[PDB]
Structure formats: C-alpha cells, structure tokens
Design a protein around this ligand. Structure first.
Ligand SMILES: Cc1cc(CCCCCCCOc2ccc(C3=NCCO3)cc2)on1
Lengths: 296, 245, 245, 49, 245
C-alpha cells in the first residue's frame, strides 16, 4: 500500500535529539573523600583534547582529597543576575548654541552598541531575548538640576519622526510618550521584547536586501532589521529656545533574560556600532606579556 | 571502537581509521521545523537524499606558514548539486550539517588544526590600519562560498575576537600524531524557523593551525586539508524562479 | 586496559601509556604493624598524605656503556620532604614503597633494563684486587641516598652474587620496544616491626642494562632514567630531636 | 561528628593483602591429555617477560 | 584477538602476531575416511603425532623482480620425516594440511603476496613458443618436492589460466603493511578415498607477488618467504616395501 521507505522515513521529526539534560545546581559541587589508587587500565588524568570535550577528570582522581560540603551559591551567576544591572547605553545632547542638536530636539537611533561596557557583556552571546527597564537621567552639562519640562517619545520604525521642536508628531496620539521635569526623579519605564525575530541578534552574518552587493553597499553587511527597534525622540516642550543646555543619559536594565550561543569575549577596542571592525595596526594581545616563559 | 568510523548519508559514505569521536553542536541533532515553531504556511519540500548527502567541496594546502581558513556555511553549498538548486529556487531554507574535515600525514609529521563552528560569523576589517576609516568586508570576503577564504589576522579571527576562546564553540582538533579528521554535526541555528540561504550564513567553519605543521625534509611536503559536508533535514519553502543572490 | 596506568598517592599522580603491569613484591601489599607484632609501646605517627606520596628523586643518563646503578632505600628519602623529617626526628621507622622507574625512547631505539628490589643489599669490595686485603665499602657507597651509586662489577652486583639470578627478587624489565617504565610495590621487609631509617636499609633498588642501549646516529642520544617512589603506610615512633645519621 | 576522611582512612590496617595462597603439593603436577589446537586469539607460547 | 595466533600439532607450535585470520579450504576441516566412502579393506595406519606436525620445508628470497613460486603437495613432504616414510612404504595415502606461509618485513617495506591452493594443479608448457610443438613439463617441474619451483609465466600460472581468477581457490594474502603470514587449512580433496602420495598431487600451493616488493635503500634487502606445513588426519594403507617413485 505504501512504499516502506516512506513509512520509516523519519523525515518530519520536529523534536531534537537532545543528548544533555539540565540538572539542579544551586551550590558548587561538594568534594568527597578520595584515597590512593595504584592500578592499571584506569587513567583519569589522561585525555584527548582533539575530541573537542573538556577534561572530565575530578579532583579526587588527582589527589587524596578530604570531604567538603560546598554550600556556595551559584545564584549570582545566572543570566538575570549578570545582566539585570542598569548601564549606560545612550547619551543625548540638547545644547543652546552648537551644531549637534539646536532647535531643541533630538532623534536617537535606538542602538545599545554605542558604549563599550554594556556592549561587551551582551556580545558574549549571539542571541538574546529579554524585556528591559529604561531609565532617563537628565540635567545640564554641569550636572545641575533645572526647572525644565521634557517629552520623550518612542518612535517605532514607520512612524513619523519629528522634524522640529514643534513637529506635529509630538501629538503622540498612539506612540508612547513621557513628560517629565528635570526636577522630578529620572523617568523610568518598562519595555517588552519587541522584534519579529525570537531574539535580538548581536551578530548577523549576512545582508538584508537581496541585491547586487557592490562596493558602496558593503555598508549593509551585518545590518539586521530585527534589531532596529526604531528611534527615541526628545524635545523640550514648547515653542521657544530651551533657555538651558540639556543632556539625557539613557540607562538600560535587562530582565527576563534568555541567551544563546556564547562567543569569545571582545578582544580589541571597539570602533563603530554594529560593526566588529578593529584597528589593524594596533592589534594588541588579549592580555599582559612577560619576558620569558620561565620567569614571572 | 572509537577511532574508526563511517558516515553515510544519501549515496555517500565517508570512512576513517583515525577519528576522535564525533561532536554534536550544542548537544542537539538536526531536526525538522515544529508545526508551532513555523510561520510560513506553504507546505515545504524535503528532497531528502538528493540534498542531504556528502559534498566534498574543496582542498587547501597546509604549509608551515598557513594562517588558517574559514568557510561561511549556508552559502558554501549553493551552485553545487540539487541542494544548491532548491536554495536558489526557494526563498526559505532550513537545515543542519554534518561537517567532516579531513587531513592526514605520516607518523613523522606533526601539527594541530583547530576545527570550529562559529555561529553568525560576522567579519570585520582592519579599519584602514589607523582604525579611523570605516571600511567593510566585500561580498567576496563575507560570502566566499566554496574555495573558502584565508584569514589575515587569525589571532582575532578577523573580527576582533580572541581565537584562544574559539573553543566555546562546537569544535574538534586535528592533531596529526593523534587523528586525521574532524567531525561536527551542527543543528539549524537561527532566531527564525527558516531564512534565506542567500543573504544569511548561519555560521562559519574555521580551520586554523594553532601548532604549526613541521617535518624533516624528504617527507612528502604536500599536506592537504579537504572539506566534506552534508546537509541534514533540509527543508525549503517559498518557491519562485531561481535567484543567484 | 593494561599498558596504560595511573598511580595516585598523596598529592601526586604518575601517568603511563606503555606500562607492563605492576609487580607486588613477594605478593603482599604494604600494611601497618599488627598490635601483636609490635613491641614499642608509644603510640606512633602516621602522617599519611604528607609522607606517603611520590618523590621524584633523580635522573641518570643511560649510555651505550653504562654499567648500572643502585639506590639503597629507607635512606634515599631522608633529607627530602616531610618523610625525611619524621625519619630524623623519630628513632623507629616502618613503611612499604611504590617504586616507579621511568625511561622512554623512540620506536627506533633499543635496549633493556633490569629493575629489581634486592632486600638487605649488602655491598662488598674487590678486597684490594688480590683479595688479601680486608677492605670495606665507605658510608658513601653503602648509603648514597638520592643520586644513587654506579656499579663497578654488575656481573656480581659488587657483592659476589650473580646478577643472572637477581630475578628471584621482585623485578620488572624496561625493554624499549615494549614499555617505558617499571612499577614495583614493596611491603615492609625486616626481622623487626620497626627499625632505624638511618642505620638500616631494608633493601636496594637495582637498575641495570642487560641488553645495551643502541641507536643509529641522529636520533636523540640523551636517554635518561628517572626514579620516582612513594612510601606507603609510613609509621614512626620514638620521638626525640632530629638526628641526621 | 567525624570528618569522614577519618572514617574511611584505611590507615591502621595490620593485615596484609596477600594475593597468593599456599596449596598442597605433595607430588609433581600430572600431565593431562592435549590435542592439536589451530586457532587465533589464544597464544600460550607468547609472553612478556 | 585475531591478529595473534598459535598453531600446535604434534610437537610443533607456530606463533604469529600479525596474522589475518585462518582460511579453511572450501569450508571443511580435514576428516578421516568414512567406513562407506572407503574400498581398501586392509586396516590403515594413523601414525598421528609422528606425521601430523609442522614441517618447515623451505625458504625463498622475495626480490623486486620475483615472479612467484609453487609447490605441489602430497609430494613436497616425501623423503622428509616419518610422514615421508609412511608414504613410500604404503601404496595408499590420505590427509589434509595446515599450510602456514610466513614472510615479514618492516613497517617501511611494502608488497603483497597471493597465497593460494589450487587443487589438481596440472602444469603446461609454452609448446615451443610457436605452439606447434607438443612439449610436456618434466618430472622436475611437475613434482619438484621441497625447494618448490619458480613460475615462468605467472600471468597464466604456466597453465593457460588467468591468475587474476586464482582467488576462487582457498587463498589468503600477505600484505606487508597488514600481516606477515598466511594460514590455510586444506581437507583431503580427490575423487578417490585414498591415492598414491607418489604419482598424484592433490593440489599445489601458489605464492605469487602481485604487488611488487619495494623499499628505500638501506633497509634490510633480504626478505625471505618460508613455507611451513602440517599433514592432518594422515592415513595409510597398502603396505609393501619402500618405494621412492
Ligand atoms: C516611553 C519610552 C520608552 C522608550 C525607549 C524604548 C526602547 C526599547 C529598546 C529595545 C532595544 O532592544 C535592542 C536590541 C538590539 C539592539 C542592537 N543594537 C545594534 C544591533 O543590536 C539595540 C536595542 O522611549 N520612550
């Protein structure tokens, strides 16, 4: 009735084989008593790194060990512990006199790859899914608190990006905006995991357009739209010159984190956002150096 | 019963008498896309044997000075075989891979290659040396296809990342005194159930000499490295005409 | 599962991939002194791990002309480590030993060493050649400690006894084409439950080349022999100040 | 109550492991019938001194 | 447990550490003659151990040009040992054989010998070249006994038959990189229960170099091939005086 090779044909198996299981590990593994072992055929110490697996040799096999009940917690090593720490990811200037952002408003492209500390931590993984708490610390360049009213407005991609301090877009009829005085504590708000992909992608080895991919367009390599969440716009609410030079610092605290595929930690200084470029002539060693392998 | 092995997919069989076990990337065998993990509503093609088989793509010559090479994956197999076709004809592609890198020598030669799989292997540039110029790697460097591409600054994997730590990736070594081939099975890894085999390369294969090749003169000086690989659970959807890139 | 082995005592682990099993002197594992075999009424010290561990005492160079060497035991380990201390501080000593002699070469070298344990290894002299003079071996020859001592008439083991028969003693051979190390476990052997580690040497370790070392020129000519050993079930009693000899 | 490594600590074992036993041997061992053996895997003759 | 082996018959024991299993001609162990397969009514002799044992008959030197040799069997063992005697004294002979051909070299030499058993190995002549002359091979060529005889046209086995097909006969190869000896056990094969060891040779043993012997200069150039064989279940009947031929 059927052709057999069709009946076995495991084609269409949606579930993955696994091979490993997650076990509880609230504390560090304890050490159990070890005694001398003088025998043939059993060699813990001997390994074959070629295989690609880490040595499974235990302390007990390398020395006579006592017993230790390790109750040291592993809680602080979870992704949430490691990442749920507010950090600077954006800085916006709103000076009186200047070439940066006069007029009294700015449009910050939402991109956390602009600051080294936070960037390196996340670039530890290839994919990350999470919600976040954005906190906005505003004041003058001197760090002085001033009686000024601001309006922050999240502008999802495709929404009208404000062209002036009095842009019609500030009616923010559907966009979420925040109105705060610099005298009020820094504004903080909760953001979900928005993105058509299942996770944000720190590294996207590919292009996003499907074209010819000539010289001029090599600007698009590594540009993944599933990460461009839109822009964050800010203006001093009014129709006249601010009167005070402002600055807004954007801090982000990740929460409800999931991360996948760990990568080697950043090695060379960062140069540009969403672009692993490094300084070819200043390629420094991962760390410190000595004078000889036989001396400290 | 561990240094010898036989890999058989489609109408291809690889053999080896000096293997070093098999690595299964992130401990997961390639599977097909769940009925609830998917979005594309059209019923896909699963050519099976005509695509899931071993393609021996290329040979490189290992020399006492070699820096190391890499191949971006989804890409590498396009233009080649029935796999390549389904990839050009369809928008969406999905699949795992069995990568078998081989290189042998005599018990009198010595050297060690690091064979690793680095997901989303984004390439960088030297930034014009001074690092003031915002240069970008060309389509020729980011997606070399077969023939692969040679590294210029392996220490940082041409991307500002320490190769010393590349081992947190499904890897395996080819130490001549010990073995003569690496075998890594990689599952489909992406943030989407399917993606375009053309503009996206789920991962890159790195083959780098960490302990240089060496031998006394008189012993055959031509030590090649050959890359053989096979797609697994290949699935395609989004049929249209054939697109190259 | 017999040519590879791992010995672990205290905080030391010896490894080997070309062993030839393990010999257990006179078929008996080192034990502690019976409550009815003993006489000394004071309660002893059994430092355990601080003394029962591997001490790699010395390296000799095997040459195409080497005659062979020997080390007297109790002694050899004095002055070295915590073991040495308990031996000087205490009058009475008792212990077994795990002796691991190692020496490797290439599959292109050849030679064979006889590694044996000869209890109560009393040394003799040539008696002034004519044999009329009643000479006696010096403290430097009878108890060389580490560094051991080279034989001058191995055929008679410098004691008028045929080495051809030395094999009636717990021995083992190091035949280069076959293995690269000897492992002999010796129990405490004496006519007393305890004795002085200083004036008495329960046995001697003989390492003698019976089949000379040889190799074509160009192959590394420096073939060393290293002696590693570990006390087992060390027990001490009769505490006083530290005495050297 | 104790430290474990003290509870196992086989230190103080007065009796020796042995490994061999003395059997009765009043006469020389007798010889039993032997027949031809043509097989692989079994090599009496081969030793490792 | 397959590359090492020990063959023991009578008072002889062959040893080997690089064997390639054992072939049993036409899958049948040598047996004695059935009570209903026989005709000769006299009760036979079955000397057992005095004849069924290993006779190491001869050594040949394998050279880069060697063509190959053969030995006719029943015959080869006459004149040698107690077997030879029972064969001359008795009219009727019957027996199987355990043939062990040995030849060793170093892991640096190379070559491959075909060792086969060809029943009723009738020899032919070149027919005077033109093939018009009806010549016939001499008693010296058809029954060389020990010392065997060298082939002159191995391609046709000096009998107009392709050696390429000689493998349909109980054979085994001696590939230096792999093994150093062939072992074939042959049962009595004839159309009669017994026959004369003198005028009839139940089969011939062929040892032919198919892949020539080769090695770089400096390695021992004398690679011998030795033939050892043992009769099995030898039975004789038809006693008279001793006849040579
Ligand atoms: C009210 C209100 C709230 C806001 C700001 C909301 C910001 C939500 C940001 C979520 C950001 O997720 C990211 C994922 C990836 C990257 C990225 N940058 C380089 C490539 O990846 C940046 C942000 O503004 N107003």
């Amino acid at each position: 009735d059927r052709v057999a090779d069709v009946i076995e044909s495991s084609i269409g198996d949606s579930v993955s084989r696994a091979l490993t299981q997650a076990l509880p590990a609230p504390t560090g593994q304890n050490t159990q008593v070890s005694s001398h072992r003088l025998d043939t055929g059993e060699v813990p110490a001997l390994q074959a790194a070629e295989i690609g697996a880490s040595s499974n040799t235990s302390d007990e096999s390398m020395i006579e060990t006592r017993c230790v009940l390790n109750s040291h917690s592993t809680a602080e090593t979870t992704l949430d512990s490691f990442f749920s720490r507010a950090g600077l990811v954006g800085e916006i200037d709103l000076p009186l006199e200047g070439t940066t952002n006069p007029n009294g408003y700015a449009n910050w492209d939402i991109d956390i790859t602009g600051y080294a500390q936070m960037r390196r931590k996340v670039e530890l993984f290839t994919y990350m899914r999470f919600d976040a708490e954005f906190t906005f610390v505003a004041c003058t360049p001197t760090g002085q608190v001033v009686p000024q009213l601001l309006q922050y407005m999240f502008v999802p991609p495709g929404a009208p990006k404000p062209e002036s301090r009095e842009s019609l877009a500030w009616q923010t009829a559907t966009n979420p905006s925040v109105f705060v005085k610099l005298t009020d504590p820094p504004a903080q708000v909760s953001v979900p995991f928005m993105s058509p992909a299942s996770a944000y992608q720190w590294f996207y080895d590919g292009y996003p357009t499907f074209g010819e991919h000539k010289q001029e367009k090599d600007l698009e390599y590594g540009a993944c739209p599933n990460n461009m969440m839109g822009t964050f716009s800010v203006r001093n609410v009014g129709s006249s010159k601010s009167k005070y030079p402002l600055v807004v610092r954007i801090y982000m605290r990740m929460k409800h984190v999931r991360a996948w595929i760990p990568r080697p930690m950043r090695n060379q200084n960062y140069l540009f956002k969403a672009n692993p470029n490094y300084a070819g002539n200043s390629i420094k060693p991962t760390g410190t150096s000595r004078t000889a392998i036989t001396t400290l | 019963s561990d240094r010898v092995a036989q890999l058989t997919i489609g109408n291809s069989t690889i053999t080896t008498q000096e293997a070093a076990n098999i690595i299964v990337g992130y401990g997961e065998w390639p599977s097909y896309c769940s009925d609830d993990d998917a979005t594309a509503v059209d019923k896909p093609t699963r050519p099976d044997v005509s695509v899931n088989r071993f393609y021996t793509l290329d040979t490189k010559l290992w020399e006492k000075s070699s820096k190391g090479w890499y191949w971006k994956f989804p890409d590498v197999l396009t233009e080649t075989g029935v796999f390549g076709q389904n990839a050009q004809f369809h928008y969406l592609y999905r699949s795992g891979f069995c990568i078998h890198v081989q290189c042998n020598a005599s018990k009198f030669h010595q050297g060690a290659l690091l064979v690793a799989i680095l997901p989303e292997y984004v390439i960088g540039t030297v930034a014009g040396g001074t690092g003031t110029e915002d240069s970008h790697p060309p389509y020729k460097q980011t997606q070399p296809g077969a023939d692969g591409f040679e590294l210029q600054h392996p220490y940082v994997l041409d991307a500002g990342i320490p190769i010393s730590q590349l081992t947190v990736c499904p890897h395996q070594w080819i130490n001549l005194r010990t073995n003569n081939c690496a075998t890594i099975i990689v599952p489909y890894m992406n943030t989407l159930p399917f993606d375009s085999a053309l503009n996206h390369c789920n991962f890159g294969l790195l083959v780098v000499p960490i302990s240089p090749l060496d031998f006394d003169q008189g012993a055959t000086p031509v030590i090649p490295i050959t890359i053989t690989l096979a797609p697994m659970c290949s699935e395609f959807a989004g049929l249209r005409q054939a697109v190259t890139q």
